[PDB]
């Protein structure tokens, strides 16, 4: 199907059954459906901690580099995952959400203590 | 820079050229 515009984007396809999310890191034409056709699958991601308490992430770094070079963009979740991986700098919103969480914790601690 | 055209001796277009008639001829 001819697409008017659009561009490659490295993103996540939400597979897995209900209440059991699981993501396939794929490089697909941005206009294509979320779980639909995709140019190439670059890895996978399991949000639910496994028996070892690990959120497994597989990133085919070679192909990820190749596609970023070819000009694929990066969805915010993928940028955050790469930042956690250390392949990219920590996302500004990751840092700022950490700080917001810290302030929330400080506020809640103060409120609980000031009974 | 600058140029002018003359409201005398004009050559003019037409309103509603009606290309529908042209296709009615074509088909």
């Amino acid at each position: 199907k001819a697409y008017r515009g659009g561009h490659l984007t490295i993103r996540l396809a939400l597979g897995g059954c209900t209440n059991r999310p699981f993501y396939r890191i794929v490089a697909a034409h941005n206009k294509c459906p979320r779980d639909g056709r995709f140019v190439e699958q670059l890895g996978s991601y399991d949000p639910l901690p496994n028996s070892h308490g690990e959120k497994l992430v597989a990133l085919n770094l070679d192909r990820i580099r190749h596609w970023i070079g070819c000009g694929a963009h990066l969805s915010k979740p993928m940028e955050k995952l790469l930042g956690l991986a250390g392949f990219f700098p920590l996302h500004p919103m990751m840092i700022t959400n950490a700080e917001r969480l810290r302030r929330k914790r400080a506020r809640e601690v103060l409120l609980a203590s000031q009974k | 820079q600058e140029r002018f055209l003359f409201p005398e001796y004009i050559l003019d277009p037409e309103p509603q050229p009606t290309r529908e008639k042209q296709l009615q001829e074509l088909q």
Binding site: - | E2, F4, F6, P7, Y9, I10, L11
Partner: protein, 362 residues
Amino acid sequence: LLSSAYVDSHKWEAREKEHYCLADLASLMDKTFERKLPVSSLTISRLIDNISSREEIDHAEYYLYKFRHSPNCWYLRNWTIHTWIRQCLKYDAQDKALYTLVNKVQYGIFPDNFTFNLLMDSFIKKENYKDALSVVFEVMMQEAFEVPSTQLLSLYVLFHCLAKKTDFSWEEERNFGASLLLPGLKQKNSVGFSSQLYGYALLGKVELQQGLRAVYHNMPLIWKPGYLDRALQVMEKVAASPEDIKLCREALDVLGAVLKALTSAEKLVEQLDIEETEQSKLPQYLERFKALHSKLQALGKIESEGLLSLTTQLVKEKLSTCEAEDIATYEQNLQQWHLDLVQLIQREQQQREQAKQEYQAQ
């Protein structure tokens, strides 16, 4: 005020007019606008030349509006504007000239300094100070204080209006302040500096009473706050300047009155919250004003001479010096305009040579 030699029209009248019946070009323009095609700047210039009466002036201003709202309004001609003004003077349509100048936006009236001075001199000859004030304000809005003749004329008109006018509305204060500050800055003499002080005082009153936006909105004034600070700076500059430069006692008195009145007596915020307001700085302003006024009187740099009297002195003294050079420049502009009209005819005929081919191609 200006010499009859200045008022001389001989050259412009001798301009190489092309004579037609005004109805001729009127019909031509009507046909062009009916076709929705662009009239020629040369055509409108020729119609302006063919103006010959008061009703013809009315027809000409109507066609001027129509042309201004046309693609070639980007090609208006200074000689055409000067011809319009001269014709209005000729047929006593000075009211229409003033109205069109005020509505320059709607019509494109952008006269040169020479024409501005011509209109102002005609108004003063008629004694029409009330409307010479409006012409001065229009000059201010156009930012055409580039010549001492216009600067002096505007200063004299404004000071006369101040002398004959006591009650003020904040918009009038804004206009007065701008129209004084501009030529005041232009004039590097005691009169110019006193005018700058007067205008700054008025503008500062407007700022503190209405709003800095109210001051700088659509005016040729800067938006940086601290007009009172600039006034005090002007006084300090005069004090540190050569003693020959003096500040008018009337200007100093009005500035003191403004400060005293301010001291005695939806929403948006334009000032950075860290920068204090003039409302808070008022007491320091008053203290600095008192100290500087005492210092200036001690230095003797204060001038108790009346503003209007001193302006009249300067007008009688330096005006003719300005008038001679102004007339020389006007003659240079006249011959330039003649050459430009020749060029317009050249282009028009050269294009008509091809315009002979519209149907020939067919």
